[PDB]
Design a binder for this molecule. Sequence first.
Ligand SMILES: N#Cc1cccc(CC(=O)Nc2cccnc2)c1
Ligand SMILES: N#Cc1cccc(CC(=O)Nc2cccnc2)c1
Lengths: 304, 304
Amino acid sequence: SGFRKMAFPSGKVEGCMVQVTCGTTTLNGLWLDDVVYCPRHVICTSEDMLNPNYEDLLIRKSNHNFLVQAGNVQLRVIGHSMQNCVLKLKVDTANPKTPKYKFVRIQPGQTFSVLACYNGSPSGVYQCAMRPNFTIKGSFLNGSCGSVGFNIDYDCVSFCYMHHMELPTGVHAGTDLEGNFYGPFVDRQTAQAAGTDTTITVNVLAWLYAAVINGDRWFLNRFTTTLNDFNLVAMKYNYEPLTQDHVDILGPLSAQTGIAVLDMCASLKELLQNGMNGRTILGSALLEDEFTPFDVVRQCSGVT
Amino acid sequence: SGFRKMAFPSGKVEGCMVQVTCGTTTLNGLWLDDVVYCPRHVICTSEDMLNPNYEDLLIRKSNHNFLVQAGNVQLRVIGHSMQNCVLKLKVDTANPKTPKYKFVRIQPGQTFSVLACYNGSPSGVYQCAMRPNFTIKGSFLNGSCGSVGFNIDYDCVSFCYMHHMELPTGVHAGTDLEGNFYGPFVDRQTAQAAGTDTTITVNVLAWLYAAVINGDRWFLNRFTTTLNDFNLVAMKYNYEPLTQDHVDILGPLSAQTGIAVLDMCASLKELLQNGMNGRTILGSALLEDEFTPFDVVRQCSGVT
Ligand SMILES: N#Cc1cccc(CC(=O)Nc2cccnc2)c1
Ligand SMILES: N#Cc1cccc(CC(=O)Nc2cccnc2)c1
């Protein structure tokens, strides 16, 4: 019973967080095996951020200029290299707490947990989604750069995000663990605007399935629709187009509840056109889109 | 930038989760030092739950009847005792991962993180609040009993909740770590109804302060009110009465934003009377009450 915005347990990632300092800049790093990953903007002064030439800035740095601290003990840096927008600092000690891991680049609409850190110390964990405009709506202050996003499949941590920047609108941008930004963003103190933050339709449908499984059924109607008809309404409401791939992914939820995917689409269409009328679904007054179909199945079945 | 429903990092609590089996019932336990704490209803069959006499049921149990497994290794039970609604199983090995800890009994309106577990294995972490009717709105399936609620102050874990039951309405009830239920609930398969789930006013005000700090200011109005006037409106909307103690606790947020507490109360009064008009605050279409004033300060300052 009940449906919560749930994050993965963070212990496996807590054992990987370190503090990286270069000059007067301190941010977080991720220590896996004998490598520490961190945003390359750790080498910048606030002045350098206006128009940085990272290759040029890096020439003035040596291994001893990168201070890596894991708990209250210093790690020895024996190598450093830049890969896209991340720095990889080779240390002489493999992290004894390195979990089984993979680096994955997620698609928009995919969710992940974030372990927000400051000075290499974890402060909190929350669940979020890669928005269709390639931003994330996180909770990050100065010093949170290098905090990471991840998913866990039993004992393997798939790292998908590393925090780099806050846009002038207060939304966040970052990279995968290969240092490639999600979206068109760059690590520069220049005004960068985000595109339309559309709603992740397949996630809203997954969450409507979660509501039916948990007893919230008031919104279920006597109508059905087609993919083309639904998508005309979705376009009008800045919802992402629903494809047959999305319908396929919702199959197990449709099977569990006995509600055909297109019937749930018709319920969603009426919610868009009529509003909630002061009612709530799963304690929310708006349609939630940061639960994927896989998250709904996992939470409703108790996958550990 | 940004404000998220954030849980404490769960690693310290993950290292304490064990599986406790008695006969055909399996639930979670919390292993601290050489004691494993778990709901006493682990000794019951589904038939015993209709009208259990726990003292009588316990006479038929011996130390060897309680199977405690930590990872893939079995712990030896050398003693067992019942304290209110929890069983304390003394084991021959102190948990090597025992963090610094305290057992606290929280007040309604207080928030905590929950590490939801199945078979002694963590599946997720979420943030919740002890409701004014002493229920929690969690996300728990069968097998989640023994999952715990906690707060962390730097390196000390204060355990405040242990999950025991799901009421017929799908809301949850549990105990503190001394085994005393929050509210009037009992560990019996009998219909128990919850009282009015009123809104935690001081938490809503804290969250309105968080919205102003993060740029959402549309709801700020040109009015002020008094505690007595505000409380007449709060009673009408099933909001908890606001006291001078609550105003005192909101002082640092009032100081940071320059918005007097009673002025924020007047904004809240207008939100209650006029509704949101299809607008959102911090991405929500309803007033959020599961952030305490301390949580807002912690998240907005980056306490690790
Ligand atoms: N890449 C990059 C980058 C470019 C310019 C400036 C900065 C600094 C920055 O955005 N910090 C920050 C504050 C608050 C939240 N999250 C992050 C980072
Ligand atoms: N004390 C107690 C108690 C009494 C009767 C029955 C039960 C079983 C029960 O409520 N499980 C459960 C399911 C789903 C979520 N959380 C928990 C527990």
